[PDB]
């Protein structure tokens, strides 16, 4: 069996899920998603806000608590084979973290940076806010944690000690959300300019060289494969 | 020398420097040239210069071949830096005191705090003698005259020398022994310990005790001679006193300027309404240190430098006298080699495409108008 | 190997003027770069040499070069003489250009253009980490006395430069009169950073808060500059590029 | 033998060519050299540029190659007089080096400093330029570069590794030549002053900083002095 | 890409990272406004535009309205008394170039920090 | 503000100092589309090369 | 003008004038764009009821 079908539903979830967003901030861009004010944006983006947060909390609670209970006590007595499969499964992982990396910081926030050419910010939670600061972030927050908590609870290479390069590749990403506090500060008091380049935003460019990290992840993977089932074939 | 490179169209509006006379064309060691003129600082200025709100009067000239005397804004002496309004003309006076002989291109500049130098034209002075007979006295308020050529020199190669010999003869006295390799070995091969024994460190002591002993006793004896000091003097000149100008009685719109490319001329349509009650005639053209005469109405009489004048340049469609009150729209084109040589139609390569200049009118009594001109300038290739 | 034990020393001797040589000229052509972009607009010029500006730049900007030198050549030969080697070769490189390019190719007066005194406080440096042979004790106290040293040291030379002047009507300097009269097509006036008071400052207590002030600095360089030489020092054989 | 005469040679081109560009930039930097869009400019110096360059490039070339070609293959089979030998020829060589660095940094640099205070700047190839920039810097470069091939490929103490000081000392003062970019933009867009401690020109400091390795570079080359001809005599 | 390609052939042939970090960062440096040129020059063809000088990429700023970027914010060269209108790319580039060679330098350790592997025995 | 129609219709056209007249809705559209796919299957194809 | 010399706790004293700014302005000190109309004290032995 080795590697399933977990791939396309890893892939498949996050694009239709962010299809269907696209589609959704297209059509309520315009026309209820202008005026920060107006009522009919309370109930088309705030709400979305305040559903987003509710679900983002309770997935995130749910699936790292799984993941924790359904931790591997038995490491030691794992078969290689077993060992492979899933080795297999958190490569499958890894695959959706960059998958949901990729929507959140390239798609969604250079997104907000077409709307930052086209009005005059009325508030911290514009249509683009709720859907890059608030949606795309934490899902792919959600999704790295996911991943490490798997490696640290079911590969034996990844146990017995917290990865530097995993635990960087994981938290500092997550250390932009936060640092929105910095944009909404740096465009209020600081640069009252749209400026895209402003040192305002320096903050999660700084913790977007922490997934840079991806490197030592990856040779720890690799490591982790090359464990028991390493080949042979491989170096012969 | 230095214009010809900077942009055409910042040359064309930062300054604009006309009335300009050079009391000498030739001239011996210690003798003075005077400068004089008037510049205006152009209303449009330039959003990358700094405002002239720290300004230097300068003159440009291939190191002190001649020494400022003297340099004035309006009628007062501006060693320092000097504040100046925009939209405001004043006049200056330089005076230079010749110093090495030869051919020296001699520019009338000021530099601006935040944005660099703007060159006005240059004229070529000749300097005739030798170096060796230059002095530049200066008398003192402790009484004494003082050759500024070679006062304190003495002093300060002794100083010098003396300091100089004091770090050798300490470097030589830790030279006289070995000094590299085996010192090296020494440190490392266990403890040095023996490298630096006395009397080393008394010596040390003594150059130590002899370094601050000299230095305060040198600071004493400099302050019972010399007495009296102060410090640099330095500090911003507010309150410089412009020209009142008379309102101009001429009022011209540039409706529509371009040039060629590649060309040596520069052509313009204008509409231009005389006021007052006199016949005015088009005389005059001057953009950026280039001046388009029409020598059937101004000739001029001041010496300016040849290459930067078009005596002929400046070509009127009509050109007859302009009755008061009568407003005309004529064709002007100012053609000359100097648009080509002082790179004027490098404004092609500008960011800015835009022009300003003079235009001088004259009536038949003799009495002439400035109005300032400006206008987007756009280049022709067809 | 050698002949001898003769010939041992005289190839050592031989080995110590040539690299004599090499450590000199290396390091004035270094120093010379970094002091002439660090503090040479103020050392060309008599009406730049101020009391706060130059006073407190110049041995803050001078005393990197003298405290790498000292932590190799003190620590690796006992060699008591960084600090004065560093100083004399940046002496020698600007008193030739000085007389031989500001006075020689251009004809600015000497007077005008000579270059600021450094040997009082390179020897202080120096005699201050031979004996108490401690690092930190020249850090603090040798720096000190470089960066108090440096203004008293160039009295004797500034001093007479600053004779009052009735000029056309106006107060100035000698020095002033010599920047006003000796053009300078490239510097102006307004460039010349020199003291120009303020509402919070006191005529007769600049020189000595501007000298305070760069003691105080040039500890902390001397600090970070003792390890950038120790750094320098190193003799590690990277197996590759 | 040992120590010959090529130590002589080594300071006396550098100090006639040297004397020479001085004496030609003496004549030739008023009349014909003030005016840069002159033609006499340029004949006497763009053509001095261009031919300068051409040599440059041939010289470096053909230097560095033959030192690379005839490096020492035996290097085990090497006498220690040979050593010795081949040590005072990379002294030489070192020696060199240095007065070449002290006629490029400090020389010409602060000659091109006499220059900024007498003209207006008309192009980044003044007559200064052309002899600091183009030649003086490239000629330290080259000299540099040969004396560190030498020491790799004839001392066996400089074979097998590439020294890092040494590597610092002849690469950072190199960095000043493409520092010259900096140089010429800190000129033009940023500081329209004629400030000689202006930030723009911090590149050269920095890298003026690198040429500090010689300390490293000298205990080096005494230790590769003491291998076999430390002594006797020296700890004795 | 252009630059890319440079900067990978150059790591590749001479697997020096000093090698490349000095000739690979220059190119990369000096290639960007070369490879960008036939893109943009159509772009910069002048027009007349209501009696005032434009390049079609100054048009087409002003005709599509952005509201929050301005004029002003634009951070383009504007001319100075000491710049030549024939030697602003050039000089730039060779700016690039240069202080890419430092970022490259600076940015080599910092990926060889991010590569490592360790296993911190907590948080 | 109201407006009617279809975005299809709208129309840029601008004349050029060099006389040529061009739409800018679409000027140097396909230029910039062939430069950029260009590059990009030029980088593509060393990787594939590699892989 | 000081409208009194001596004064018990809690009563008032006014003091009146004219300042004239200087156009020769040092450039060492920033043009008066933003000033403020102090009182000089040994701290709050009088506080300030009103300016203008
Ligand atoms: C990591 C954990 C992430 C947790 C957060 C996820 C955010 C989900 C969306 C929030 C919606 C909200 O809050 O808004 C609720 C909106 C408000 O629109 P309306 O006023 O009803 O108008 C009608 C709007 N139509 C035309 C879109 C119906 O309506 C809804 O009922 C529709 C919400 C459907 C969400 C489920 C489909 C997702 C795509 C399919 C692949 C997964
Ligand atoms: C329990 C789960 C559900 C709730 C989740 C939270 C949703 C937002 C609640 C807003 C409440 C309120 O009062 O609004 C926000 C009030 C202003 O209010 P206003 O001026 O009326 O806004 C009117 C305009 N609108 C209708 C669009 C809101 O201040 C603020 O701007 C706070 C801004 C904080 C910015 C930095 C946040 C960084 C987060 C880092 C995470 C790691
Ligand atoms: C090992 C350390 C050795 C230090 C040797 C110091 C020599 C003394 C110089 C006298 C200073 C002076 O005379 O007054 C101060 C003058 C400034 O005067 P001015 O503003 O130019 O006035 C011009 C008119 N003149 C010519 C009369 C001056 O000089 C200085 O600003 C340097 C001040 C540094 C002195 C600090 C010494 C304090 C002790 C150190 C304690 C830890
Ligand atoms: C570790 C700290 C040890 C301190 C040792 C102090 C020794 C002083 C030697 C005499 C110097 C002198 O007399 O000269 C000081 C000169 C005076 O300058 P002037 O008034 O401008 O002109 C010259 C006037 N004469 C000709 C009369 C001198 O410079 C200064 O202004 C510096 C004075 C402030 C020094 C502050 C030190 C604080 C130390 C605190 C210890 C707890
Ligand atoms: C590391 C490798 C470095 C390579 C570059 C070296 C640069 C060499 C000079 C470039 C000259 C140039 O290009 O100019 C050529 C100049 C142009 O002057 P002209 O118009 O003929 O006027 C007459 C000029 N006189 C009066 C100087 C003749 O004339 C020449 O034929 C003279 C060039 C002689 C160079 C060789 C002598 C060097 C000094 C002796 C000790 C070595
Ligand atoms: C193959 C060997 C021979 C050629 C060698 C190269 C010589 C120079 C060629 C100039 C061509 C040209 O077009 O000039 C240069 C053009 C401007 O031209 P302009 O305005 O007409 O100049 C007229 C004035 N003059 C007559 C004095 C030239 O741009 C530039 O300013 C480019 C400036 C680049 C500065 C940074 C360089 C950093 C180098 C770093 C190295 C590690
Ligand atoms: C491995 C390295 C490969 C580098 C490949 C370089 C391709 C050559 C491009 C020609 C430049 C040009 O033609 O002139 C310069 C033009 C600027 O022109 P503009 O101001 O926009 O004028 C507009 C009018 N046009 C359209 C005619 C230009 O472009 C540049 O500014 C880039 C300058 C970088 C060139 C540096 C090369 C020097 C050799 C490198 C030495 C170590
Ligand atoms: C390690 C250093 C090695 C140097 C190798 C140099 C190879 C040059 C290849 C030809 C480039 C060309 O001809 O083009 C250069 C273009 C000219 O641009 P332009 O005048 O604006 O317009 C285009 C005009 N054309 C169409 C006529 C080209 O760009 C530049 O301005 C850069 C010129 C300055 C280069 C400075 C290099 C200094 C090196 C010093 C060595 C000691
Ligand atoms: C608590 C801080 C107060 C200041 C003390 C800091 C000095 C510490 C330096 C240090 O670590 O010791 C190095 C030498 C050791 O030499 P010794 O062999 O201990 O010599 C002792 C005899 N002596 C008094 C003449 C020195 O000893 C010395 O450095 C010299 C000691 C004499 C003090 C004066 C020397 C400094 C002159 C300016
Ligand atoms: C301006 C800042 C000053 C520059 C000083 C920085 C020097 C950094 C130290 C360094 O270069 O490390 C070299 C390693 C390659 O190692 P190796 O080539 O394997 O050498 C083995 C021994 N060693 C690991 C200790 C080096 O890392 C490498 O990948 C090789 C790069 C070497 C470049 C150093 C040259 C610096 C010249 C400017
Ligand atoms: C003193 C500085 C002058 C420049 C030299 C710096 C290059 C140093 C790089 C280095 O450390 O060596 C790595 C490789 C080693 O390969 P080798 O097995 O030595 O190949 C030799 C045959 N060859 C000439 C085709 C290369 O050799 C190479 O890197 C390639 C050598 C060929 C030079 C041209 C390659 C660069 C192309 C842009
Ligand atoms: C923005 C800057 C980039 C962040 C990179 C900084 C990483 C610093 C390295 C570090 O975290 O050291 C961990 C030690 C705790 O050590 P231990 O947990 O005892 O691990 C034993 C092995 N080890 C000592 C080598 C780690 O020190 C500790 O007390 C644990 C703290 C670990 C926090 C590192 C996570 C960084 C995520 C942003
Ligand atoms: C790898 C990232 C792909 C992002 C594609 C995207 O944003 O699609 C939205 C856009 C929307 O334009 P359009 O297709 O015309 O449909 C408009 C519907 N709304 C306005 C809701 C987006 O086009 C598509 O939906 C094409 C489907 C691509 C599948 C990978
Ligand atoms: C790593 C480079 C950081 C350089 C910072 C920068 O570009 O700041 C520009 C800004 C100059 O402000 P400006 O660009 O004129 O802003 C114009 C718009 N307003 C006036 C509303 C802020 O300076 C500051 O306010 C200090 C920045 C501290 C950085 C740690
Ligand atoms: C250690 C660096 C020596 C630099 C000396 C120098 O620049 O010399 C040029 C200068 C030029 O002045 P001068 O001797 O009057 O001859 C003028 C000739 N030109 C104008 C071509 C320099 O003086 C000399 O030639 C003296 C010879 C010194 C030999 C070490
Ligand atoms: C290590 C100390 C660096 C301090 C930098 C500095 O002195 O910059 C002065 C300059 C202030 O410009 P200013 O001195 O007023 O320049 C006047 C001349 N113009 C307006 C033509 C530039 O500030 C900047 O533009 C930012 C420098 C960033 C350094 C990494
Ligand atoms: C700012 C001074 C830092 C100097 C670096 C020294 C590092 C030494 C490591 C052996
Ligand atoms: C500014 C670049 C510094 C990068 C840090 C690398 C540290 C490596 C230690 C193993
Ligand atoms: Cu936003
Ligand atoms: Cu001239
Ligand atoms: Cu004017
Ligand atoms: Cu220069
Ligand atoms: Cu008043």
């Given at each position: 069996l080795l590697d399933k079908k977990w791939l396309t539903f890893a892939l498949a979830i996050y694009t239709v899920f962010y299809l269907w967003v696209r589609w959704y901030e297209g059509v309520y861009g315009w026309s209820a998603g202008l005026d920060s004010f107006a009522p009919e944006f309370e109930t088309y983006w705030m709400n979305f806000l305040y559903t987003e947060i509710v679900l983002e909390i309770v997935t995130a609670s749910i699936l790292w608590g799984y993941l924790w209970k359904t931790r591997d006590r038995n490491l030691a007595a794992l078969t290689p084979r077993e060992e492979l499969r899933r080795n297999f499964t958190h490569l499958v992982w890894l695959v959706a973290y960059a998958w949901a990396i990729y929507w959140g910081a390239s798609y969604f926030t250079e997104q907000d940076g077409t709307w930052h050419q086209?009005?005059?910010?009325?508030?911290?939670?514009?249509?683009?806010?709720?859907?890059?600061?608030?949606?795309?972030?934490?899902?792919?927050?959600?999704?790295?944690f996911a991943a490490f908590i798997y490696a640290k609870t079911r590969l034996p290479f990844f146990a017995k000690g917290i990865s530097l390069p995993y635990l960087v590749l994981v938290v500092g990403p997550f250390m932009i959300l936060p640092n929105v506090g910095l944009n909404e500060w740096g465009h209020t008091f600081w640069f009252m300019e749209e400026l895209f380049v402003a040192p305002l935003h320096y903050g999660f460019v700084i913790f977007g060289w922490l997934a840079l990290a991806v490197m030592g992840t990856l040779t720890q993977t690799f490591y982790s494969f090359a464990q028991g089932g390493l080949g042979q074939s491989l170096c012969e | 020398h230095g214009e010809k490179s900077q942009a055409a169209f910042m040359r064309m509006r930062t300054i604009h420097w006309y009335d300009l006379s050079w009391s000498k064309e030739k001239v011996k060691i210690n003798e003075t040239v005077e400068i004089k003129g008037k510049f205006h600082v152009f209303e449009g200025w330039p959003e990358t210069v700094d405002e002239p709100d720290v300004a230097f009067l300068n003159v440009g000239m291939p190191g002190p071949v001649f020494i400022r005397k003297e340099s004035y804004i309006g009628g007062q002496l501006v060693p320092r830096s000097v504040r100046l309004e925009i939209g405001k003309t004043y006049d200056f006076r330089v005076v230079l005191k010749a110093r090495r002989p030869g051919d020296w291109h001699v520019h009338t500049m000021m530099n601006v705090q935040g944005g660099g130098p703007i060159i006005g034209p240059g004229k070529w002075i000749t300097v005739e003698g030798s170096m060796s007979e230059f002095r530049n006295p200066v008398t003192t308020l402790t009484g004494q005259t003082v050759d500024l050529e070679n006062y304190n020199e003495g002093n300060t190669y002794f100083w010098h020398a003396?300091?100089?010999?004091?770090?050798?003869?300490?470097?030589?006295?830790?030279?006289?022994?070995?000094?590299?390799?085996?010192?090296?070995?020494?440190?490392?091969?266990?403890?040095?310990?023996?490298?630096?024994?006395?009397?080393?460190?008394?010596v040390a002591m003594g150059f130590l005790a002899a370094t601050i002993l000299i230095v305060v006793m040198a600071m004493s004896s400099?302050?019972?001679?010399?007495?009296?000091?102060?410090?640099?003097?330095?500090?911003?000149?507010?309150?410089?006193?412009?020209?009142?100008?008379?309102?101009?009685?001429?009022?011209?719109?540039?409706?529509?300027?371009?040039?060629?490319?590649?060309?040596?001329?520069?052509?313009?349509?204008?509409?231009?309404?005389?006021?007052?009650?006199?016949?005015?005639?088009?005389?005059?053209?001057?953009?950026?240190?280039?001046?388009?005469?029409?020598?059937?109405?101004?000739?001029?009489?001041?010496?300016?430098?040849?290459?930067?004048?078009?005596?002929?340049?400046?070509?009127?469609?009509?050109?007859?006298?302009?009755?008061?009150?009568?407003?005309?729209?004529?064709?002007?084109?100012?053609?000359?080699?100097?648009?080509?040589?002082?790179?004027?139609?490098?404004?092609?390569?500008?960011?800015?495409?835009?022009?300003?200049?003079?235009?001088?009118?004259?009536?038949?009594?003799?009495?002439?108008?400035?109005?300032?001109?400006?206008?987007?300038?756009?280049?022709?290739?067809? | 190997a050698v002949r001898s034990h003769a010939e041992a020393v005289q190839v050592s001797r031989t080995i110590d003027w040539m690299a004599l040589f090499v450590v000199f000229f290396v390091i004035v052509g270094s120093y010379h770069i970094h002091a002439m972009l660090t503090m040479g607009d103020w050392d060309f010029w008599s009406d730049w040499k101020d009391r706060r500006l130059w006073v407190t730049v110049t041995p803050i900007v001078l005393v990197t070069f003298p405290?790498?030198?000292?932590?190799?050549?003190?620590?690796?030969?006992?060699?008591?003489?960084?600090?004065?080697?560093?100083?004399?070769?940046?002496?020698?490189?600007?008193?030739?250009?000085?007389?031989?390019?500001?006075?020689?190719?251009?004809?600015?007066?000497?007077?005008?253009?000579?270059?600021?005194?450094?040997?009082?406080?390179?020897?202080?440096?120096?005699?201050?980490?031979?004996?108490?042979?401690?690092?930190?004790?020249?850090?603090?106290?040798?720096?000190?006395?470089?960066?108090?040293?440096?203004?008293?040291?160039?009295?004797?030379?500034?001093?007479?430069?600053?004779?009052?002047?009735?000029?056309?009507?106006?107060?100035?300097?000698?020095?002033?009169?010599?920047?006003?009269?000796?053009?300078?097509?490239?510097?102006?006036?307004?460039?010349?950073?020199?003291?120009?008071?303020?509402?919070?400052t006191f005529g007769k207590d600049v020189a000595p808060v501007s000298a305070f002030f760069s003691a105080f600095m040039s500890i902390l360089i001397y600090f970070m500059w003792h390890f950038i030489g120790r750094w320098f020092s190193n003799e590690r054989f990277l197996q590759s590029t």
């Open positions: 086209t009005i005059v910010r009325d508030t911290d939670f514009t249509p683009s806010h709720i859907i890059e600061f608030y949606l795309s972030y934490p899902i792919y927050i959600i999704t790295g | 003396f300091w100089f010999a004091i770090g050798v003869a300490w470097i030589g006295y830790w030279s006289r022994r070995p000094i590299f390799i085996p010192r090296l070995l020494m440190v490392d091969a266990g403890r040095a310990d023996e490298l630096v024994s006395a009397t080393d460190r008394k400099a302050n019972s001679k010399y007495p009296i000091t102060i410090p640099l003097q330095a500090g911003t000149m507010r309150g410089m006193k412009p020209l009142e100008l008379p309102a101009p009685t001429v009022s011209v719109k540039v409706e529509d300027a371009t040039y060629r490319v590649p060309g040596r001329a520069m052509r313009m349509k204008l509409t231009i309404t005389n006021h007052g009650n006199s016949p005015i005639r088009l005389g005059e053209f001057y953009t950026a240190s280039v001046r388009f005469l029409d020598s059937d109405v101004y000739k001029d009489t001041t010496g300016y430098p040849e290459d930067l004048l078009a005596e002929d340049g400046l070509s009127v469609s009509d050109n007859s006298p302009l009755a008061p009150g009568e407003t005309r729209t004529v064709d002007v084109t100012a053609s000359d080699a100097a648009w080509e040589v002082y790179r004027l139609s490098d404004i092609i390569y500008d960011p800015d495409s835009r022009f300003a200049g003079l235009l001088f009118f004259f009536d038949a009594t003799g009495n002439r108008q400035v109005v300032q001109i400006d206008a987007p300038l756009i280049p022709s290739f067809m | 405290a790498a030198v000292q932590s190799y050549l003190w620590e690796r030969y006992r060699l008591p003489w960084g600090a004065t080697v560093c100083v004399l070769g940046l002496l020698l490189g600007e008193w030739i250009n000085r007389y031989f390019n500001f006075w020689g190719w251009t004809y600015f007066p000497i007077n005008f253009v000579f270059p600021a005194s450094l040997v009082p406080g390179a020897i202080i440096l120096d005699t201050v980490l031979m004996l108490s042979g401690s690092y930190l004790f020249t850090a603090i106290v040798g720096a000190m006395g470089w960066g108090l040293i440096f203004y008293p040291g160039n009295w004797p030379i500034i001093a007479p430069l600053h004779v009052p002047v009735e000029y056309n009507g106006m107060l100035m300097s000698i020095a002033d009169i010599q920047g006003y009269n000796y053009v300078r097509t490239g510097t102006p006036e307004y460039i010349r950073m020199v003291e120009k008071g303020t509402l919070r």
